[PDB]
């Protein structure tokens, strides 16, 4: 297809009033009988009807009960009762056959066949284990039957499903079940009819058929309505659903208290799917989850995966209002529901777990994955202007930066002002398909606030850079002068970047008071120009606390002495800025040691001793009593390597890895006695946040106690591995052991495989922990694991567990190019059956320009090999075309 543009939107020529679907479900060939009740838009001349349709085996076309034949050269001579198929497979009916009056309704009935077992794209109807499941977002419903496959077309649905009674005892679709019984002529088959009373776009359609067990629990809304919440899964996993069920109940209660949102259906169903591209999908009343985001068990699920399940479960329920009842006018507005819903699950996770812990996790993920995207060839604003394949723009920018943009609304307007904007947003657009500007206008109108410049967050890509050009205390005036500058580098298709509306939370820590001296302690500064000076009231000499709570998704250039950083590490009040001060000091040490290693390529690299400021602060955090142990663990943990690499030019993952290990080993020697004392204090599975924090700090201290990677380190990690009562401490010890070549690593990996007992999720970790190992010939191990009996590229979770994890290994960038070729060979094979996963796999080649010339030539070679592959998908073609946009021709 050709490139699509945001400003080319136009309402549809025709409307869809009713959808009558009949499914004759078989694993090899499913018949889909569909009747669409349509009419032309008012005040519009007659025009041809064009319906989306992809990979359908068409049997018959019927217009108002009259059969139409396939247009051919023989039908041209005389037959006018014909239909046509365009070059893309869309169903075309000439305007002469349709009613002349616009309001006159007509019926288009089609019989098509699809092949679920051959549907390896996992879009539309396909087989997943013992289940027949669906996935339609964004444009997958056209792979089931003909439709106007766009989110601004809504209609009422009536769905009938017929299937084998033994293989598919449970049949599910959107809405309420109105009929169930046996198939009349065919013995052994049964059916069910589902009617959705509320109109919905086609991407929210879903159907499930297979052998399912369920747990359930009632929920009473604030109006008194009772909603039956049920979690479905295959029989073998039906005892691992309580954590997901309890998460739905918390999400429904939280949305009522925090935003006044009330569920409107009698049933809320969640079905687990073992073969799923996304993490979960918000199909109206019939959510479908990836198994890794639903199933939970103490012996298989880590604390982080437990929290991720709670977060995604809430995310999918929050889509019922921000996504389903108020939906998108077009796919350029994807961040209207994704950015707003991610922000909603971030507030939810913060209230359910720890606010500071969640904020630190979100910022670290943003400044690694999203910052790389925003500085690369695929950089796009949260509301893109153009796209080729819409599946390529379900990105960290649209999701996670979009949430940071929503959070900036909350910062500028306050909680009560943000709530008033939400109420007006839901009141105006309930049951409609709207845009980003509608949400921004709701926030503006409800608060009397001008948000015209704020739209630049939606229009301009790239990470803004905020420089602290001057920050000096003025004792004569009792003022603190703060001068700030902002600039944003060019991104593909947009060189000039106009100033953003940047809210910057600041604070001052008095040098005498050792606490906040501002009242209120945090002040929201509105940086709206390219350069601006602010004057804060400071009674005494102070130290600046800049960008508290990460109030804007920007880079910060702020020169601080190690003494002022140590002052903030000990006396700052903002939880993020307190951690940011420690993260800033450790990042600079990591970055400098990596540049020394990068200068000599590891040939005689001598590191200066770690400064006492860093070690004493590390020791104080380690020995501290009474504080939150999760904040303790995240402060002591070394900075994420992908985050530090985004500040380097060029990026050298091997130099950054050696820099990380050298710091890990030096602090392990300097504070070995204190580390061993705290480690023994954290011994002796509960889901309580107190026990999660204890295990989190215990695993971090083990990392600092095993840096030498000698026989003593392997023995300590092996005991941690064997004595673990859950997956959290077991997987952490295994991950540490896999960097230590020896018998302890092989024994742990062999035992880990057998202890899985065929569990696909535990086997994913077994593949991933090997792909991320810092061992020699880790590439050859990954290449060999592709032949393993339990490896199949057709399952996205298993493919990502091995291949995607390997792309995050620093040895993936080995200068011999063996790692790049491995990914390219994988992307080529996967693209022939699952374009979505292959396009995301090829994304690891996007930042080729940021690496050294040797790695540039190797990555450019694989990028061109993929781009020149015959039959390459539209999805993967767009990704590598963008990557090669700034590359030499030929
Ligand atoms: Zn989603
Ligand atoms: Zn979402």
XYZ file of C-alpha atoms in Angstrom, residues 336 340 406 409 418 421-422 425 429 434-444 458:
21
model
C -5.809 8.906 22.585
C -4.441 7.699 28.490
C -1.115 12.761 29.824
C -1.877 17.475 31.838
C -7.507 16.801 35.668
C -11.332 17.406 32.291
C -11.902 13.648 32.360
C -14.261 14.203 28.152
C -17.829 11.722 23.678
C -13.019 11.063 18.631
C -9.478 12.426 18.290
C -6.594 13.665 20.421
C -7.711 17.277 19.952
C -11.076 16.399 21.513
C -9.367 15.194 24.698
C -7.112 18.262 24.792
C -10.096 20.566 24.255
C -11.924 18.828 27.110
C -8.989 19.514 29.437
C -8.760 23.105 28.189
C 1.429 15.621 19.773
